[PDB]
């Protein structure tokens, strides 16, 4: 990784939902759901054949 960006659930300027989603994302990130989601869609067809 050359640069270091990051995605994020966008909210309006001064929204009440920013703090409640931040607590919700950190809860999902430690239970392992955001590794279950990424390995469901970036899993792909399951390549290489013998590597």
């Amino acid at each position: 990784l050359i640069d270091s960006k990051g995605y994020g659930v966008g909210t309006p300027m001064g929204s009440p939902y920013r703090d409640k989603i931040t607590i919700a994302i950190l809860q999902l990130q430690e239970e392992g759901k955001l590794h279950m989601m990424k390995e469901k869609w970036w899993r792909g067809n399951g390549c290489p054949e013998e590597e």
């Binding site: 703090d19 607590i23 950190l26 430690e30």
Partner: protein, 50 residues
Amino acid sequence: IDHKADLAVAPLAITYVREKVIDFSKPFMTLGISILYRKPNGTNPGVFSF
């Protein structure tokens, strides 16, 4: 939490429990768990190395 300080510029990792009590900024450094292992040497390639 007791307002005896203002910032916490330190290796203070954002987690679930600390975020529920205090408030962090967005991460200035991201990281994870990785593995140390000794760099390979090649001093004993067996005895039938020919």
